[PDB]
Design a binder for this molecule. Structure first.
Ligand SMILES: [Zn+2]
Ligand SMILES: [Zn+2]
Ligand SMILES: [Zn+2]
Lengths: 136, 85, 74
């Protein structure tokens, strides 16, 4: 329940009127907190962070770089559940996809490189072809 | 609730060009807007934005013997890499 | 002329479901973005004002730029 720790850390930043950069750093501290978690706890931390990022109280111009930062640790991180959570990720990028577009481009660079090097050539080019890159 | 500027009714955006390039059947520029010389002479159903316009098996929507013409310049037709049609 | 904008979730649904109907209809031109159809949406938001003062397109966009932050510099 560092799940819960970050959960209410962010439920009370929901209750904050902090500024652009300031509140950004608040969420960034809570991010890097969840980053430095370890395992299944860190996994549901991912879960709950992005469940945080869903709102408009979380701005789009917030979640831009907040989840950019959520992301740029992931190249460093294990591959199995990285595929897993890129899947769930993209499934939940579904709503305002253009809010996520470039970030998705990179997610799927990573993810398709996984399938490529996992030789899951099907799901590789398949789930590459999910994207409207320039057609977004 | 007296201001946070919540959602009124709103009005939106559209087009209609086409989901193709198409670039006016580049082999000449009697356009794809235009029934060109050779294909005003041939003239299938062809109009002021598709005289021939599509992502076809060619996708090089090139006029009848204008497509044949730039297949004349190369009988391997790499125009979009289908043979003149 | 058009640029970045909030585009709340229903605006997503508008472009996308229109593209449902419309990619069904036509593709290549689609639900592009065009500000000058925009006007002001500032109404019974939660206002001591009983006021609905619609504004022009980028009137709308830039007032959008200044909503919650009760003051905002350059
Ligand atoms: Zn002509
Ligand atoms: Zn043509
Ligand atoms: Zn001919």
């Amino acid at each position: 329940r560092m799940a819960a720790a970050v959960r209410q850390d962010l439920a009370q930043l929901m209750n904050s009127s902090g500024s652009h950069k300031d509140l950004a750093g608040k969420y960034r501290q809570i991010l890097e907190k969840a980053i430095q978690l370890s395992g299944a706890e860190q996994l549901e931390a991912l879960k709950a962070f992005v469940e945080a990022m869903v709102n408009e109280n979380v701005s789009l111009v917030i979640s831009r770089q907040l989840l950019t930062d959520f992301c740029t640790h992931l190249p460093n991180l294990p591959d199995s559940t990285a595929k897993e959570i890129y899947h769930f990720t993209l499934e939940k990028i579904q709503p305002r996809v253009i809010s996520f577009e470039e970030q998705v481009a990179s997610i799927r660079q990573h993810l398709a490189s996984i399938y490529e090097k996992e030789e899951d050539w099907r799901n590789a080019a398949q789930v590459l072809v999910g994207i409207p890159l320039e057609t977004g | 609730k007296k201001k946070r500027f919540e959602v009124k009714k709103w009005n939106a955006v559209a087009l209609w060009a086409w989901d193709i390039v198409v670039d006016n059947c580049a082999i000449c520029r009697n356009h794809i807007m235009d029934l060109c010389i050779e294909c005003q002479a041939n003239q299938a159903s062809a109009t002021s934005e598709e005289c021939t316009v599509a992502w076809g098996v060619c996708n090089h929507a090139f006029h009848f013997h204008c497509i044949s013409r730039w297949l004349k310049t190369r009988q391997v037709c790499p125009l979009d890499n289908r043979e003149w049609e | 002329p058009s640029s970045t904008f909030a585009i709340p979730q229903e605006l997503e649904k508008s472009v996308q479901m229109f593209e449902l109907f419309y990619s069904q209809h036509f593709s290549g031109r689609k639900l592009t973005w065009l500000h000058y159809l925009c006007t002001g949406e500032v109404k019974m938001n939660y206002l001591g004002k009983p006021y609905v003062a619609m504004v022009t397109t980028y009137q709308m966009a830039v007032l959008l730029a200044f909503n919650n932050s009760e003051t905002v510099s350059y």
